[PDB]
Amino acid sequence: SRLLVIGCGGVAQVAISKICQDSETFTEIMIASRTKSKCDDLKAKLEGKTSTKIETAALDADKVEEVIALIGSYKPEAVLNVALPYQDLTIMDACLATGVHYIDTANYEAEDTEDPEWRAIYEKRCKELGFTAYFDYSWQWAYQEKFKEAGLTALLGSGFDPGVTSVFSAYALKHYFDEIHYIDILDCNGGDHGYPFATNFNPEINLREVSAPGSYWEDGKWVEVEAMSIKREYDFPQVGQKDMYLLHHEEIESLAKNIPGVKRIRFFMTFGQSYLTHMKCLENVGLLRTDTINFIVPIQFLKALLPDPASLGPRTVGKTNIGCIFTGVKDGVEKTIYIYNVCDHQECYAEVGSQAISYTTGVPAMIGTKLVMNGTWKQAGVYNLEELDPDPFMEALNEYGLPWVVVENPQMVD
Amino acid sequence: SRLLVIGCGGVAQVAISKICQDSETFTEIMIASRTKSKCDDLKAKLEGKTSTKIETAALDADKVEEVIALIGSYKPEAVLNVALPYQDLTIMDACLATGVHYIDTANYEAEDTEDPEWRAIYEKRCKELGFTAYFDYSWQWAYQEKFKEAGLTALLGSGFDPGVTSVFSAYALKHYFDEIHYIDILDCNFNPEINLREVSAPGSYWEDGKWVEVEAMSIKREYDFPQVGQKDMYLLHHEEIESLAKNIPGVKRIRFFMTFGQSYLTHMKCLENVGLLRTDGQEIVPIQFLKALLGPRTVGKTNIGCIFTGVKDGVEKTIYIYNVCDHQECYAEVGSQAISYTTGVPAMIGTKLVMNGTWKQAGVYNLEELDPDPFMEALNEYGLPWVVVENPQMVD
């Protein structure tokens, strides 16, 4: 009934709104983030439409002392981290210090990738496991023992992917298969903002997607490849044929560990050709580069010229479809299942005033938070969603805005 | 034997390089431009490989007295203008004042196209002639009588196009035809404002004593370029159409086409989409932020030439004269782009021919008015060998 939410961007705004819709679970919330004015505007926008009591504060979640002081002052039962993944460990340390629960949506990656202690563990991992993405669960899983000892719950990656995709996996394994062997996670965004080119997020993340090496997991080994070197096509329910490429994703790591006997796990994402050409163009004229220069570094000078940051929410027309195709065995017989959710952009902006990218992450975040606090998912330790009972989550998904679909004998990627 | 060179960008870098390779004609040269640092780096980079004595200076060729004081001080026999077209009139004035010769590569375009008295001249022209390009020869042709009286030579547009494309025309008229009727000029392949107006300015050509202006890039064609292949072409307006229509007797139609790769046309369309070509911290204009951004990675070839259709001994005849230059043999020789190379060499030849006596004629001239022969032998000699095709393939 008393919750502290850290961060106040797109995801947070959806998660906070859905939270105020279930005011009987959440009687009081505190919205703290780097720029307090964002917290205040959201409070303004929400106050009067909910019975939930909303307080706000400025907070630099990169400083644990500042985070601890806050928990100490507001006294919450849990902390929902909807800030950046850079703050994961700091917020987790404070939760342990003050004995409150932790929920987030993205795993940890250092903000400064030149930090000596971070490189040493990172480089060692690049040599041992085989994949070189800057983020992974190693740092957060390491809290397993201290959290279990403090009787604290740490629910990790509770958005859509990661998050729901793991809930889909657990659900599939509990009701449809005896053993899952192949998991292909397909993320499709078929929305049209109306502009020739525009970015939904921090424009440097877009650069990370198309340029970072892509990787997957196959029979106990990570497999890394040249960025965007694996292409495919799929006819997405309610959207259509879309070109999709294999990228690396957080959940592949937890899934490979938690789904017994699993043989291969891949994650693909859609990329329209105009978008792809628009961005090898921008990176060719070096407009995405970070090399500071004078006299302003460019990538964010571009951020200035591009369309309003978040004012694509009212403009965007289209749909997203994120799901998973499972191949496994039930009663000694091969079986394929596809579970997905189709989210419509304009329904998202009409309801909470955001795009579907924020919506599909925000809603699962609140549900993950609800189940932890209401007791359903309160277990000491650090957890990824596939390790918990999927049932109450799948119900909350139907109840709170993200109904799902299950298809037996679907169309395969290959 | 003594020359003042104004400007020190790409073209100038090539030109001076070529100039120093012929030190028996050019004993000492002076390299002066806005930023003296480049003049010095170029000077260090060359001297020791040449016996030509090299001096350098800072000069804002926009102020006429500063130019005159430099000419009076350095006492050169001629001035090669390889700065921007904005400095043409300023430099020609100094040349006339001090009695020295003049050579440039592009004709005049005012730097501030909003300046009142310029526009009055400009618009009057737009109404009479029919073409609206900001640049034209009228300004410089006006100097004809004064230069002739001072016994001075002003050679206009001595690059590839204009320039060599005009030498090709004079050559074709002298050796291959009795009369040229159709001239089609074909140019095949770091300033986005030049590229931007290149793809957006109205296109125009000349036909039967009249100019015809059309929608920008509304006219497309394709041609299989010798040594390069099939490429896409669009009709653009170009300087030499004006001089040729005046100087090629009986010519009936003159057109200019330029190639535009699909890869380039989209890059251009992408940049215009994210608003990087716009013109408007809250004190910046986009297109100039873009210039701040940008040798061996570049691979390819250029092919610039002209297709003439005419009459010789009462029979229609077609001729194709062109030059093929490859980017790296020129970057391996003088360290530059093929665009600067194909303009740099013509810039020197005209200068050499003007002051060694070959082309010294009092007055203002475009290249088609002079004997093309010494210029082409020179083109073969200094790096830009040409080709002649009888019965080549047409356009249309």
Ligand SMILES: NC(=O)C1=CN([C@@H]2O[C@H](COP(=O)(O)OP(=O)(O)OC[C@H]3O[C@@H](n4cnc5c(N)ncnc54)[C@H](OP(=O)(O)O)[C@@H]3O)[C@@H](O)[C@H]2O)C=CC1
């Ligand atoms: N499938 C999934 O599950 C996905 C999950 N996500 C996750 O959700 C988060 C995205 O939120 P997103 O909508 O892009 O959020 P935004 O980038 O708009 O989030 C902005 C909020 O983070 C706050 N913040 C950042 N740094 C700090 C700090 N040091 N201290 C306190 N607050 C801070 C910001 O402060 P300020 O307002 O001043 O900038 C801001 O309010 C991501 O970290 C990402 O990992 C994203 C995509 C997919």
Ligand SMILES: NC(=O)C1=CN([C@@H]2O[C@H](COP(=O)(O)OP(=O)(O)OC[C@H]3O[C@@H](n4cnc5c(N)ncnc54)[C@H](OP(=O)(O)O)[C@@H]3O)[C@@H](O)[C@H]2O)C=CC1
């Ligand atoms: N085929 C052809 O016939 C072609 C012709 N051209 C011609 O070549 C010239 C192009 O030179 P380009 O290679 O593009 O040159 P650049 O754009 O690199 O020329 C730069 C030089 O111009 C000098 N400059 C500019 N303004 C002044 C001034 N007011 N006073 C003194 N110096 C000045 C610059 O000084 P600084 O470096 O300090 O700015 C610099 O050295 C043009 O005039 C154009 O007409 C262009 C393309 C091909």
